[PDB]
User: What shape does this take?
Amino acid sequence: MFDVFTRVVSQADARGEYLSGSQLDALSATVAEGNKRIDSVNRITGNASAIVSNAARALFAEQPQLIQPGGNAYTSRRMAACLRDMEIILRYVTYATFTGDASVLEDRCLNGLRETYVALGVPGASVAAGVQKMKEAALDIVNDPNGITRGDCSAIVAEIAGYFDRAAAAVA
Amino acid sequence: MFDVFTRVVSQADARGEYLSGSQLDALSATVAEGNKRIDSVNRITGNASAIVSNAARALFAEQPQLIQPGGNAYTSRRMAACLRDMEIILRYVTYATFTGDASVLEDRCLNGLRETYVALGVPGASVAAGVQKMKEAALDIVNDPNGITRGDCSAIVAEIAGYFDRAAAAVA
Amino acid sequence: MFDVFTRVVSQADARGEYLSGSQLDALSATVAEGNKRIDSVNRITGNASAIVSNAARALFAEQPQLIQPGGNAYTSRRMAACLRDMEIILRYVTYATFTGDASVLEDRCLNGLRETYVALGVPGASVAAGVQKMKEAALDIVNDPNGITRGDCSAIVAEIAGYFDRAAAAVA
Amino acid sequence: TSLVSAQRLGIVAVDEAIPLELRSRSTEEEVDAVILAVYRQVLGNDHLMSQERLTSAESLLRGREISVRDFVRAVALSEVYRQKFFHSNPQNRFIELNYKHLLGRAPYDQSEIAFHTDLYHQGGYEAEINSYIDSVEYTENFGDWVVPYFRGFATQRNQKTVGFSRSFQVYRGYATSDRSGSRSRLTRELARNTASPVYAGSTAESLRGTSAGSRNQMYRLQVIQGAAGTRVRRGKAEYLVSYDNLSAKLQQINRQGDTVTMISLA
Amino acid sequence: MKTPLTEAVSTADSQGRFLSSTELQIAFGRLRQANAGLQAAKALTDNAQSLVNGAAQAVYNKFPYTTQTQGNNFAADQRGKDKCARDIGYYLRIVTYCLVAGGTGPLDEYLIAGIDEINRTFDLSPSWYVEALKYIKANHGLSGDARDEANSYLDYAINALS
Amino acid sequence: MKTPLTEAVSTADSQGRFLSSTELQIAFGRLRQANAGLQAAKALTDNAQSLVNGAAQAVYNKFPYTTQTQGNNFAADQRGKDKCARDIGYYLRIVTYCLVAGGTGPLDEYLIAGIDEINRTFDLSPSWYVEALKYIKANHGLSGDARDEANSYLDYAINALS
Amino acid sequence: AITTAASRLGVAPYNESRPVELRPDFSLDDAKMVIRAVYRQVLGNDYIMDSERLKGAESLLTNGSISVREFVRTVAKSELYKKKFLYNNFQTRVIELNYKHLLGRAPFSEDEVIFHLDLYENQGFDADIDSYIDSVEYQENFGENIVPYYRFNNQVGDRTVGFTRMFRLYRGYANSDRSQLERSSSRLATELGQNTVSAIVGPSGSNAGWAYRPSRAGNTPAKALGGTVPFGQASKLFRVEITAISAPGYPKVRRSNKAVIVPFEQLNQTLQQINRLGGKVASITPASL
Ligand SMILES: *[C@@H](C)[C@H]1/C(=C/c2[nH]c(/C=C3N=C(/C=C4\NC(=O)C(CC)=C4C)C(C)=C\3CCC(=O)O)c(CCC(=O)O)c2C)NC(=O)[C@@H]1C
Ligand SMILES: *[C@@H](C)[C@H]1/C(=C/c2[nH]c(/C=C3N=C(/C=C4\NC(=O)C(CC)=C4C)C(C)=C\3CCC(=O)O)c(CCC(=O)O)c2C)NC(=O)[C@@H]1C
Ligand SMILES: *[C@H](C)[C@H]1/C(=C/c2[nH]c(/C=C3N=C(/C=C4\NC(=O)C(CC)=C4C)C(C)=C\3CCC(=O)O)c(CCC(=O)O)c2C)NC(=O)[C@@H]1C
Ligand SMILES: *[C@H](C)[C@H]1/C(=C/c2[nH]c(/C=C3N=C(/C=C4\NC(=O)C(CC)=C4C)C(C)=C\3CCC(=O)O)c(CCC(=O)O)c2C)NC(=O)[C@@H]1C
Ligand SMILES: *[C@H](C)[C@H]1/C(=C/c2[nH]c(/C=C3N=C(/C=C4\NC(=O)C(CC)=C4C)C(C)=C\3CCC(=O)O)c(CCC(=O)O)c2C)NC(=O)[C@@H]1C
Ligand SMILES: *[C@H](C)[C@H]1/C(=C/c2[nH]c(/C=C3N=C(/C=C4\NC(=O)C(CC)=C4C)C(C)=C\3CCC(=O)O)c(CCC(=O)O)c2C)NC(=O)[C@@H]1C
Ligand SMILES: *[C@H](C)[C@H]1/C(=C/c2[nH]c(/C=C3N=C(/C=C4\NC(=O)C(CC)=C4C)C(C)=C\3CCC(=O)O)c(CCC(=O)O)c2C)NC(=O)[C@@H]1C
Ligand SMILES: *[C@H](C)[C@H]1/C(=C/c2[nH]c(/C=C3N=C(/C=C4\NC(=O)C(CC)=C4C)C(C)=C\3CCC(=O)O)c(CCC(=O)O)c2C)NC(=O)[C@@H]1C
Ligand SMILES: *[C@H](C)[C@H]1/C(=C/c2[nH]c(/C=C3N=C(/C=C4\NC(=O)C(CC)=C4C)C(C)=C\3CCC(=O)O)c(CCC(=O)O)c2C)NC(=O)[C@@H]1C
Ligand SMILES: *[C@H](C)[C@H]1/C(=C/c2[nH]c(/C=C3N=C(/C=C4\NC(=O)C(CC)=C4C)C(C)=C\3CCC(=O)O)c(CCC(=O)O)c2C)NC(=O)[C@@H]1C
Ligand SMILES: *[C@H](C)[C@H]1/C(=C/c2[nH]c(/C=C3N=C(/C=C4\NC(=O)C(CC)=C4C)C(C)=C\3CCC(=O)O)c(CCC(=O)O)c2C)NC(=O)[C@@H]1C
Ligand SMILES: *[C@H](C)[C@H]1/C(=C/c2[nH]c(/C=C3N=C(/C=C4\NC(=O)C(CC)=C4C)C(C)=C\3CCC(=O)O)c(CCC(=O)O)c2C)NC(=O)[C@@H]1C
Ligand SMILES: *[C@H](C)[C@H]1/C(=C/c2[nH]c(/C=C3N=C(/C=C4\NC(=O)C(CC)=C4C)C(C)=C\3CCC(=O)O)c(CCC(=O)O)c2C)NC(=O)[C@@H]1C
Ligand SMILES: *[C@H](C)[C@H]1/C(=C/c2[nH]c(/C=C3N=C(/C=C4\NC(=O)C(CC)=C4C)C(C)=C\3CCC(=O)O)c(CCC(=O)O)c2C)NC(=O)[C@@H]1C
Assistant: This one.
């Protein structure tokens, strides 16, 4: 897996070149965003249970067929698995946010997830909807201007949105 | 193959939902940039031969092992094929720019391409280097301020760079 | 795995047949050649490091793309894996020479090796070239007339060449 | 197939392909498009050098002297086709290439191989190639004026189900070609009248989690195994192992005498 | 999926060509249309429940035997009315996809292809859905380009059914 | 790659845990370091040719038989001198990667893993590269945290070679 | 096999159990049984808290994304395994535990310690774990689909010293590797280094002298060098291991554990004296020929 830094390194190594002054400066700018990235990971993690439960509640309210008898999230084991998956995906999204690179999310969580779900009969579109609900809640929590030093977090918030969207597409 | 519009549609149908007011406004903002997108395609197309040839010459100057006897781009047939691949990838990048979606790359240009290169012994890392060089030359072409109604094309340039990066990663 | 003797036995058992007088006579001739076979195995083994390293050097000299940055044999771990593979192949070729039957080489080395290299992105045509370089060095070593009882090792040399050819064909 | 499956299987572009027909009073562009499509299909999407083009056959088609089917046959009988697909290939690989190129499908059964091996042994190359183009299957799908196109991913009248699964062995993706000879991936399953799992597009992928080692890569080894240790429950097995354990797994399989049929990234 | 942009690309790609002025003009045509399509999609979405309900009753009025005959294919019971309003909703929803896409693609991919097999198999009359579509044409309230593009897709469905 | 960020996530993932204060503190540590690391990388990169040529000459001085003895493993001809300069450049470039990544990950992945097999197979003396690495330590002109981090990676390689 | 002494040795429950196999097309109850077995075996019968479960690895096992062996591998490489067995232990202790958990047997020889200590030191813990799981021995006994289990019974390839050493590592059914009298100390460092064995002392509950453990120094040797000469007229000698000596009290009693070599003709007196010391006989073993 890569982080924002080693992503650049690996690209440079395959070309056998030193990082350019432009690339180094791009990393310096990333370093300048580090505190915002740490806060964003902290804020999502601090609210993880709420993000998952509220998104799952909203999801089943919109898709009652999931929780009717015979539905894919019906029975405790399957509901429990569904809630577990929502948290796994959120957790890996926070991993990607922490590292600044999607490789952890892609390599460990999403790679092969669609196939697992298709084989199981898990409705991918409903998972994607759930991920979208978690995304909205997470972005609001990150952007909340209270109790934190004020500043512009649009760049980090956009990166997090991309990670959530990756997860949604990977299963949708 | 999707475009920027039908991508949204396909997801919405999988959920059995109408597009939301936000998705419609999002697609509307896409329409607002339509002229910039069309210009960017027009510019890369108008310079396609120079982009390809200049990138090729640069690649073989950085990687002269490719063209020495025994090299993967030695002999006219192999050089001709290499030039075709560079042109093919650039053409599909313009398609993705035109449609506003990556599916055309994933469906056609990149579909099995790494497998093809491994079977043939084409050095995929070198192809990635050549793609990166076309990328740099293409974005300068797109950003050239002369002879065009001045405006901010940063979003499209970022999108185009993404398509080039997707191609490079597929064979890297 | 089979050796030269059990190969014949297995074919006879499948027919429910005693070995014929001709089959026994052929094995006697094999026995009469046994000392040369042992000498060939001992000579290849005794020069294993030189055979491998000389072959590797020659390969990278003729195919410098392998060792340029981004090349499959670039970086210490990949270079070490490549040298390991060369030694493995040489080792199983000596095993086949020792037993007088290709089965050990086919079952325990070449089994799935082409598919493995394809999956890994290892250039099989370059492995084949490496194996040929080891072949040519090995045969000269086996044929060296100095410090050995003089005689005709043509048949054993042809058999050994055959084993090397299997390996080169299989990996490509 | 529909988007939901075609996207996973990497065959969206095949699904949206439209048969190309040469109409009466076609333009020069339409003839050009048809010639290009024939070369792409019959030559399995190789890069075609200008020195390899059939100058004369192209002229005759453009002059409406010969039909599209005649032009397909001219290309199939050409030295270019022979050099690409026949002279350096074993016969069974050659035959499945003819089925892909000329009928747009994979072979259905071993007897198709036997039929065409016999025909080649009897009447040579020309008789073998003509059997495809003159067949009822060719005439009813493409006739004289439609360029052949791949059909194996769609339910055809009088096909065998296994034709669909086998299509993925001979069609490897849009950006692929039948250029390197080689062996057929279909040999065993044709000979034994069986099927193999479809690992194409993104269906080869499997979950990694924390179990995929230092490179976060799993490899899928498909083996044929017997009991020559613990009890063997299936004659066909798959193993998922990380890069770090791949050498150990090969050595384990090898020591047991079991056969590796395929390995790929997962 | 039939749409101006994807058809420009697939045609150029089939010919091995870069995009030229022709495909650029196709894109301008798409841009000229798109806002009206998006406006039309919004207007239809906001009234989805009214249009679907009114269309369902319009069919019931025109074909009264549907609410009175017993049978899996009829709307005499509650399930049938649910099936029916669902189907009409499918038509209306997918039509808005066409307005968003700027072509019949969504109708072709999701509804039209195979509909003849379905209606025969389940004994569903194409005329019922034509009447429903006719209602939506008469009631969607659109005007200008939005009306023109929307009626083309409704009529396209009607023509496919008749 | 052993970098602070990836290792933190990998350890958390092993336990199926969200990141916590421990991992956030790992991140602050990385941030405290990163600017110095990047400044070191730029300084080594800008002086790369001087450092590499100087290091090669330092090896030739300490081990004069390398430029005088015939053999594939020695630098008595231009072929061998070029290999040697290339190798030293590899060490330097990858060390700059370690400074950018904030760990020995790049050295471990690209150079150190398997270096013993290479040096043994091709009869290269690890003492040659130790000498070059000492030259680079003593001539990069880094100060402060950049010096400290650069030398830790240079010493990491030296320790590996001995 | 082990029949008469099975219960007192703590082996009877394992005699009564079958290997836990994950069959192709397994059911969910099959997966749960594997998960439970793997946690009990590989984590040495420690209680596992819900917060410590490897939920992701369990999911992948349940899904067939990893076989039993790969699930074992994941558990063995987890921070949970390392916290329990690596970070607080002498590496020889770690190797003992790995053998018990992953191979179901005790180390046979010092060579095994050399191999695994070097492998850990040169390539790290993960590499060492792989060596157990990718071993020929693991493959032959458990293969891809069977949870590792204790191999009490004699098998091809065994050595006798393995049998005695299993009861240095296994201390009974209601017990865990982290809840044994010797605590973190290597059980076999000395046995392996000297290639010696110890009299078997079965688990508590079924063996009164279960707590007998020798001291660092000042132990009685196993065999009666010199024969009966020091004892005068004696027919045969026995080595008696005694534990829980308290009655006289300090300083008359220094170590509560003692091994004595006594002649046949004094066994009656010895048992009487032991009882009055309060002690419990741990083992009796012939000491002369
Ligand atoms: C970034 C890409 C650069 C840029 C682009 C840009 N273009 C416009 C506006 C227009 N561009 C066109 C294009 C064409 N007209 C034609 O007839 C054809 C030939 C077939 C083409 C390609 C058109 C029609 C317009 C609108 C009218 C006009 O000429 O201005 C803009 C202005 C904003 C807009 O959205 O229209 C911009 C920004 N501008 C830059 O500075 C970048 C280097
Ligand atoms: C082709 C391989 C070359 C060759 C071989 C050759 N060898 C012999 C005879 C012998 N070689 C051995 C070998 C060994 N003796 C040992 O103790 C060991 C070490 C374990 C080895 C490897 C032996 C025992 C003999 C027999 C005694 C003898 O010295 O002759 C021959 C003679 C024919 C025979 O079969 O005996 C030959 C031909 N000779 C060449 O010229 C080739 C270059
Ligand atoms: C009744 C004693 C009290 C009560 C109930 C209540 N339950 C929920 C939500 C859920 N209940 C379940 C239970 C099951 N689902 C199953 O599949 C099975 C096994 C067959 C069981 C037992 C589940 C899974 C949920 C959550 C998902 C769902 O909504 O179906 C609620 C709503 C909770 C919420 O946050 O929406 C309530 C109110 N509440 C009381 O106060 C009663 C005393
Ligand atoms: C919840 C929003 C939806 C849902 C989920 C659901 N998932 C499963 C089963 C599995 N989910 C996974 C996923 C993972 N396991 C991992 O370790 C990781 C990280 C690498 C992931 C992403 C797996 C592997 C399974 C299968 C094994 C298991 O049971 O854990 C189920 C149960 C399916 C069944 O029939 O047993 C469910 C219900 N289902 C919905 O309906 C929601 C839309
Ligand atoms: C972004 C979505 C929101 C936001 C973030 C933001 N944070 C800072 C600055 C700091 N945040 C921290 C964080 C922590 N300190 C700790 O000790 C821990 C616990 C382990 C954490 C998570 C720190 C250290 C700083 C710097 C010092 C300070 O006192 O601020 C900023 C300011 C810019 C900067 O990056 O330093 C910003 C913008 N602010 C918003 O308004 C968003 C809602
Ligand atoms: C000499 C008569 C004139 C001339 C030559 C010139 N050629 C190039 C570049 C290339 N030449 C080739 C030719 C071949 N490559 C092959 O593999 C084979 C078959 C074995 C041939 C015949 C190729 C492919 C190139 C391009 C890539 C490369 O440089 O290797 C150049 C440089 C062109 C450039 O833009 O870099 C030149 C100068 N130029 C003259 O003016 C001479 C009269
Ligand atoms: C050297 C001439 C070429 C080369 C080789 C190369 N191989 C690998 C990796 C592997 N090679 C094997 C092969 C085997 N493993 C075995 O145990 C056996 C006998 C049963 C064989 C034949 C395997 C399994 C691997 C991967 C797993 C492992 O390394 O243990 C590499 C590295 C690949 C990578 O790092 O991704 C390389 C470089 N590469 C070249 O370029 C030469 C032509
Ligand atoms: C209906 C009960 C279930 C269902 C079916 C379904 N099948 C397909 C696609 C195909 N079905 C076949 C099967 C055959 N083709 C043949 O020629 C033969 C007889 C010799 C058989 C048995 C094939 C080959 C396909 C793929 C090619 C094709 O679609 O034409 C689909 C379509 C999937 C898609 O994404 O397009 C469907 C829907 N689906 C269900 O949900 C039911 C459980
Ligand atoms: C050039 C930068 C590098 C290079 C290229 C190279 N490629 C080939 C051969 C093929 N390339 C393709 C790729 C495509 N075909 C398509 O239709 C599409 C779009 C959908 C793509 C992307 C294919 C299919 C082939 C094989 C078919 C054919 O070769 O005709 C070669 C030729 C290899 C050979 O002659 O054996 C070469 C040389 N080689 C380099 O060294 C550069 C790094
Ligand atoms: C310079 C200090 C001395 C010297 C150097 C020398 N090196 C080689 C050959 C090789 N060097 C390497 C090293 C690396 N390859 C890598 O990928 C990396 C990590 C990124 C390293 C450090 C390798 C693998 C080789 C062999 C293969 C190759 O040539 O690339 C030689 C030639 C050895 C030979 O036999 O050809 C030489 C001369 N020699 C001296 O005398 C200097 C003092
Ligand atoms: C037969 C002459 C006498 C006899 C024997 C007897 N032995 C056992 C049980 C075991 N024997 C061994 C011995 C070995 N294990 C080894 O690894 C080695 C060398 C490789 C030896 C010699 C072991 C370990 C056991 C127990 C484990 C097992 O049997 O698998 C028994 C059965 C004990 C019981 O059932 O409880 C018996 C009967 N018994 C007599 O009465 C004869 C005098
Ligand atoms: C509660 C009344 C008292 C108490 C209990 C206590 N026990 C432990 C730890 C263990 N208990 C057992 C017992 C069993 N494990 C089994 O499998 C079986 C059935 C065959 C039994 C009877 C074991 C083996 C352990 C150790 C394993 C583990 O994970 O702990 C503890 C934990 C001690 C500690 O964590 O340090 C405790 C607290 N403690 C009291 O104070 C009560 C009097
Ligand atoms: C060197 C200064 C002296 C020396 C050392 C020596 N040690 C051994 C053998 C072993 N050393 C250990 C040590 C450890 N095991 C651990 O778990 C740890 C902590 C993580 C340590 C430090 C072990 C267990 C062994 C036994 C296995 C092995 O042999 O490696 C030897 C070999 C003894 C033998 O007879 O083989 C030696 C030589 N010896 C001296 O003379 C120096 C004073
Ligand atoms: C007090 C802090 C803890 C405690 C003590 C305790 N000890 C005993 C019994 C014995 N203690 C010894 C100790 C020694 N023998 C030696 O030779 C030496 C070194 C020179 C020492 C320290 C011995 C031999 C005994 C047994 C004989 C005797 O009782 O005198 C007991 C009584 C045990 C009993 O079961 O009656 C106790 C209570 N107990 C605690 O709970 C404290 C933590």
